[PDB]
Subunit: 434 residues, 3 copies
Amino acid sequence: VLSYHDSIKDAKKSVVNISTSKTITRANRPSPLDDFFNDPYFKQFFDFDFPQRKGKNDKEVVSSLGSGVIISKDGYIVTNNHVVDDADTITVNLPGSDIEYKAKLIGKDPKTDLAVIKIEANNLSAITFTNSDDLMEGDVVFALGNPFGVGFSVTSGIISALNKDNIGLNQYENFIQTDASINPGNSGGALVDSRGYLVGINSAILSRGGGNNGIGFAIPSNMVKDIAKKLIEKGKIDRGFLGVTILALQGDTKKAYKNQEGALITDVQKGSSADEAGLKRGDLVTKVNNKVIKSPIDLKNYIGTLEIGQKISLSYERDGENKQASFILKGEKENPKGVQSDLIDGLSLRNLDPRLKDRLQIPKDVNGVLVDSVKEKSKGKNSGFQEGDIIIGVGQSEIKNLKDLEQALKQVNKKEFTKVWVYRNGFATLLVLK
Amino acid sequence: VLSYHDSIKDAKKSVVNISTSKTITRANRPSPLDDFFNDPYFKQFFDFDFPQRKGKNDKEVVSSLGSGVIISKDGYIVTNNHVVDDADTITVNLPGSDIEYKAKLIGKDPKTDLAVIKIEANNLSAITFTNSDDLMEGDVVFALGNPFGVGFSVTSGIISALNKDNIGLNQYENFIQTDASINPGNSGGALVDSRGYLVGINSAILSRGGGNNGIGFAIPSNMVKDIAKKLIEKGKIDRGFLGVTILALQGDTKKAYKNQEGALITDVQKGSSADEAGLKRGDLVTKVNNKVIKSPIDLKNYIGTLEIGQKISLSYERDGENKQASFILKGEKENPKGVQSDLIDGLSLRNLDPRLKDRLQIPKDVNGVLVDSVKEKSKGKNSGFQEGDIIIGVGQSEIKNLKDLEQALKQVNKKEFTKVWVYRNGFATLLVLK
Amino acid sequence: VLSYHDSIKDAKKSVVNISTSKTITRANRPSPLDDFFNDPYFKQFFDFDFPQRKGKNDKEVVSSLGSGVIISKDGYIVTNNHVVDDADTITVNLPGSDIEYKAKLIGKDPKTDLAVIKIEANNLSAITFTNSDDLMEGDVVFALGNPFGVGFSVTSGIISALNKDNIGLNQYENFIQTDASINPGNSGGALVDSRGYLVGINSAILSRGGGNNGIGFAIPSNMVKDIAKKLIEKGKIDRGFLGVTILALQGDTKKAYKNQEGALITDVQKGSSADEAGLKRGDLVTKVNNKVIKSPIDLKNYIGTLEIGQKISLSYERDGENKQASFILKGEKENPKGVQSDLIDGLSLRNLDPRLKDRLQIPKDVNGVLVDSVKEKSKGKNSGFQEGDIIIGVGQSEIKNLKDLEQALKQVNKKEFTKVWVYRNGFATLLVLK
């Protein structure tokens, strides 16, 4: 007979079930979903009244169930922090040895949502940690933990997606997808490859009944490697940022922003390291000295893997022109004021109640800002806006003064183009600014 | 590592994702269901507030999200018709080249629910369009497209049921069925064999919330291959009929109707191409010039795949002889009228309120139709019916006259046997009319 | 092509579909859930309005729908009891033969919820009954029958859990699990190995949507093998017991109760075949002559595969010493009463309201039981309990007299340690009795 138990024999020696007595399970508390209340038996079941009364799965209310992986022979375990929030007596149960000591939280971060914990025994297994990004889609894998109280279990699968954020279960995310039947209680148990080496970790699943419908998510194993090291070596993680807001370059933005390529600065968050290194609006982020940028979630989760105060000679372009300049890693809590202008670009413009005829007898249609002149480079002249125009609406939405221009012009480096409405000598026309 | 990415590889460049901008998304409007309503975040998620705001999945109410297949190098895409119903500005994402043109809707048919659509670029992919019906159950397949908007993501699995109607997603059906995980947004997307060739087109799934639960359905490629052609040729498909209600031959119906075999005409829609070809009731449809019949979904779907005014020399049998005249392909809209028979054949029956003693003083029990003669070949004569009985009942249901008699004696060829109740020279028997 | 249709050929030849017609479907009536209602179509769909009307799958209100297996060439089929509860006119549709007879129920046992039924024809197949316990996690299998009324469909998978109770669908349980997708109506249908031999029988599935979401459940084929012989033999099965209460030995029980290894008797159910074989409380059950015990679910389900009145020369131990004596298979309804001592072991206690100064005026903290002596072996003197104490409560719970004392000192053999509350000359201590 062919079986792939052969992974399953050793994989349990690393992948723990977790017993988790906590006086406060208030982070891993269910939200007001209309679930199997009114006849709640053993947790995460569905069946009717059956003879085995309470005791088997109950403690999840003033304790928690979960899974973890012992990363090193030092007996340091990893699991998801929602599983280990309020870490009093985080008892474990290792399938393949049945041992039941308290574990000692060494350190956590709720942003990456991850923890490292010393279990107090010796001759504890490590895990062959390998790289989550040698993967292709279609690669075979085994995903592991204790699903919904059955005991320790493993489901055979393939990858069906790579390196996915837009998920934000907490704050920093790069998930990889398998089709494998996995549940909560596999919360912190592993995803290994077909050779039984560590490639990601389970936490959560897109599905309708909490148990799998095709769409299991693992964290990267490379992510947890450096995350665990930072949670060991100071007992937490400490990020800054480049003090920024960011998007990806979109296809129509690209030609409109003169066919440079990288992540779109939306707004540089003033006087942070971005600004001081001379990054601006209409610029694009291209590369960290270790890591390549195209998207907003690239810088976010790369900085979810960098620490305080080190300088970074980051590469960036504007228009057609690259610089590499020197930026301190400066967070949201780290920013001291700065400049940007790129559809207010030599716009000499000012407030009105103008001194000419004739339109009508209401300020509604004539407060805004009047154009003194328009720089040749400004996307306005690309697009047919001229000196002696009057701006009344900016992205269809209307304005009364310079403040409410400069507020909508601070949202333009978030628009491929702008639907301005510009009154002239007599009529208001519609333009398409890029 | 063994990975069947190799299919995945070229199937993205044929199996499209759809930026289906249309202003009336109201033919695929969500049914009034208790889903994740009042607080739905991104469409087709389950989740509580995560850091990423709106801007990734929301457009599906003034657009749609889907998948399709470029069949020939013309760039003739096919997808579901319901994805493109009201087809205004249907623009594309071709996974792996990102080409955001609109496509011309060349034509759509809402009975099969499929449409042919020219994408206005070049070097656009064929697909290797093999037979769905050379498939057996257990054969290995991949399942393709974009599930719930996660982007282009594939699965692989096996066939667990074949060549099926009784699903009624539209008006013409013959789906084949896999375990592999597929959701909404794979709507119109491919099912390819282990070798990478098109054996079917995914349109729906038997699940409990739209994430796959082992039961996904793809239209056979061989039906889409003649659908797409009739829609390339004139922008629509025109289907006929034989003018004939139809069923499968049930098991006692074989032995009652003397051991013929074929699809059971339940009642002829009168004087049609069936009737003028000799097809009556008590008759069984066996074969179209090209296609073999035992059930009514055979004749239905074979007519689905044929167009008007041609003469089909179809074969049928009655009692114990098989005949071969010729039928026009004549619609429900097309049918002159007709002759019927069965359990009234050469019977002589007329109305009553009788002139003999005795019974009772209420008409409920004695109105009906009386029996002058019963033909010897007739089913009544198989089954305990006599001359000088009075029919009161025609299958546990009662009659006041010839009309409600001859109406149930139209429904007797929807029966294996009939429970007539028949008042005799003094008492009401009950009988078994094979 | 590689496909495992090879087993799917001869499996259908024994794995029946059933059209279980009876007037009383009132055991397999739906329970009040928010499953689909007010809008039903065909049973176990989810789908909106389809052009295939009532007639396909209504009947399971006034019939059952299920699966089974023809065991032997004698025509003897095996299925759930709940499928044939009130076996009126149990009609069959064996796939690939269609022989629409009634079957004759030979016998049933609701306890295992298993049947044996004769189908009344000739040349009927068998099934290759192999061992369910030469088995392992991860071996390849197939799961079979009628998944929601479709015909004969088969899925394929790997074993994900072994020999289990705590599922409780009836009264006796030793199920095995695989991921492979099975629905009610596979009720009574099979699980066969990768060579086509019978290893398991699916009854139900711990799903979220009633169709399989990952967690099917097969009673072992070596359990239904002898069950079937006891059902052929006489139409029913006869279960005794050994007239007892049992649990598995907990780890700190192990160490307190002197490091013996078996199933923990919790309370001997008094003058059974246990007590009159010398078996006591705090004695561990090690081996039945044919079946080795470590848990209660052992002895339960071994009784679940054993008949009346035979004498069973069973192994038990006390503290460090093994005995083997003989035990009749005596029911819950078969036991003359009784011998009982454990943390009352030499405890010479009596009722009080006691004649010394001073404490308080309310009886609430001084009614209880006074301790005249404590024998040296008592887990009391292992743990701090002395003579002249006063027991006021036994594991937090307060006692008023000898009767309430002894109710709780009967349940201590359901504990590893007890937190007795014992008043002394002036104060009350809490203790930890092992």
